[PDB]
Amino acid sequence: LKWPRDLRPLAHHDLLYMGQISEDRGDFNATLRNFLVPRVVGSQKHREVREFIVRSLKDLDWDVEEDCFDGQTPHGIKPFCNVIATLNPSACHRLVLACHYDSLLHKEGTFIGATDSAVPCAQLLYLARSLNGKLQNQKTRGDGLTLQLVFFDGEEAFERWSSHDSLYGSRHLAQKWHEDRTSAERLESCLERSEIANQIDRMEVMVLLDLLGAENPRFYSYFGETQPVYRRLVNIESRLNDAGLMELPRRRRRTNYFSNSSTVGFIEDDHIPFLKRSVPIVHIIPSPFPDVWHTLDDNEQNLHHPTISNLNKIFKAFVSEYLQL
Numbered sequence: 078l079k080w081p082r083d084l085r086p087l088a089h090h091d092l093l094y095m096g097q098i099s100e101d102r103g104d105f106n107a108t109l110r111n112f113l114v115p116r117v118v119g120s121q122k123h124r125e126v127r128e129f130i131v132r133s134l135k136d137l138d139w140d141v142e143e144d145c146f147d148g149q150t151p152h153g154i155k156p157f158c159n160v161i162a163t164l165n166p167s168a169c170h171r172l173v174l175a176c177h178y179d180s181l182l183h184k185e186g187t188f189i190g191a192t193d194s195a196v197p198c199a200q201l202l203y204l205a206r207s208l209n210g211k212l213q214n215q216k217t218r219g220d221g222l223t224l225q226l227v228f229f230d231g232e233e234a235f236e237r238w239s240s241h242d243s244l245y246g247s248r249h250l251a252q253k254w255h256e257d258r259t260s261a262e263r264l265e266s267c268l269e270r271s272e273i274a275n276q277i278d279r280m281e282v283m284v285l286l287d288l289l290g291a292e293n294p295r296f297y298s299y300f301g302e303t304q305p306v307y308r309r310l311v312n313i314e315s316r317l318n319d320a321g322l323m324e325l326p327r328r329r330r331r332t333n334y335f336s337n338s339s340t341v342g343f344i345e346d347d348h349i350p351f352l353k354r355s356v357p358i359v360h361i362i363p364s365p366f367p368d369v370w371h372t373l374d375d376n377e378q379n380l381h382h383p384t385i386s387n388l389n390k391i392f393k394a395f396v397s398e399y400l401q402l
């Protein structure tokens with residue numbers, strides 16, 4: 078049916094501003110350097126990455142919560158901590174942007190997972206920092222909508238991927254939020270026709286970023302439910318190219334990352350436990366996966382920086398349009 082929130086197209090002025098990248102490049106890369114380290118569950122470096130995310134966002138005055146638990150894995154008992162940052166906690170509805178911050182425990186050697194998902198992690202923090210002034214202003218409106226960032230732990234399997242060996246953080250969080258009962262009267266400015274029975278119902282849409290940072294990603298609409306949101310991404314990308322704001326190999330090329338079609342493809346990722354509970358999902362993951370996927374070549378040098386800049390523009394423009402920044 079109709080998307081529950083009427084989606085006001087970004088004014089041209091705001092598109093142009095959101096599509097300028099300065100020192101902006103430099104800020105993003107400084108943030109990204111913090112994630113370009115092996116961050117296997119249980120490791121000191123995983124703890125330091127978690128602490129980095131927490132601190133970056135508390136420094137921005139967001140409410141930051143940690144959903145920590147121990148879970149049984151094929152390698153024994155393991156500590157997991159999801160990181161959840163919420164710009165305005167009392168706001169009824171959340172635009173949720175997500176990724177995972179653990180890296181695969183690769184048996185062949187040290188695995189950085191630069192695309193998987195150091196880049197998405199950085200892009201989330203970079204969004205919060207670069208939009209901070211606008212976000213802090215949006216937060217005072219009392220409009221019932223806010224931004225939330227979720228950095229999932231334990232997305233990767235320890236051994237062969239299975240329903241029980243994967244998605245530890247997201248399975249746990251989806252459950253916890255689902256059983257956490259609330260209602261519209263308890264919350265600030267829920268939309269009129271809202272059915273809120275628990276926390277999971279406040280996730281207006283979850284936008285899941287995964288495997289980003291390689292050249293020329295090809296995205297598709299994986300979910301009919303979120304097709305009106307996906308199309309804003311298509312449209313935004315299109316206007317940025319019209320504006321001449323996309324970095325390309327040659328003059329007169331256009332990016333076409335967001336395909337205006339849909340694929341029949343099923344990808345298991347951190348969205349799955351939320352999908353089962355009726356959260357609308359936009360799955361921003363390329364198909365095919367990057368060539369470096371789950372190989373030791375998923376490292377800093379194999380990242381494509383102009384694509385990353387282009388994506389950052391699309392995401393900033395998108396969040397600006399959704400929250401009307």
Ligand SMILES: COc1ccc(NC(=S)NCCCn2ccnc2)cc1OC
Pocket residue numbers: 193287288343344345346364365366370
């Ligand atoms: C090599 O190409 C593929 C291999 C496997 C699958 N199918 C699934 S369900 N993979 C699990 C995805 C979870 N995940 C999260 C982060 N990194 C991986 C699809 C692929 O290309 C479309």
